[PDB]
Amino acid sequence: RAKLVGAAREGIPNRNDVAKSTGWNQDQVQKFPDNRMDSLISLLEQMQTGQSKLTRLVKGFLILLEMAERKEVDFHVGNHIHVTYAIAPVCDSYDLPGRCYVFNSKPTSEAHAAVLLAMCREYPPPQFASHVSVPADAEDVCIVSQG
């Protein structure tokens, strides 16, 4: 959006621009300790570049035909979880390297939070490796969900 990028990034002057653009809690952006400023500026202005996920969908479409022509598979959901869009959790989440973020649009049921999750780690354990062994991207998956 025009509010985020500008021509080039600025030292976030107005916090009212942050409230409308990319998150909830105009209260939790009003109060924000004078410590996470360097983290938030480094967070928000490194989101413009870096976006490509062909191999992400490969593991999903591989697991698709693993349980498409072959019958139903009952499995578990093992994950870590992020909470919000532009709040302390989303600011605190950014820290630490090798953390993959998968946004859940409607995390109401268990189905969507189960499939995108199992897709990410190595190759869903323990479901017969057989043909392919896809490399495990930065392990320790962290989904974004409202519920």
Binding site: R1, S21, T22, G23, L44, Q46, M47, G50, Q51, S52, K53, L54, T55, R56, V58, F61, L64, L65, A68, E69, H82, Y85, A86, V90, S93, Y94, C100, Y101, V102, F103, D137, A138, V144
Partner: protein, 49 residues
Amino acid sequence: SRIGLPTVVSLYDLMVPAFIAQNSALEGARLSGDLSKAVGRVHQMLGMV
């Protein structure tokens, strides 16, 4: 040891939503029970050529 598709999953954007969605053409590829395999069986067979 194929190195076919390269995309080191760098996924900073899904952390930060409220991003303008790109309107483009859709694939709409329906992996039919038998045909989905056959498409790959033709690709590997084309790959030999």
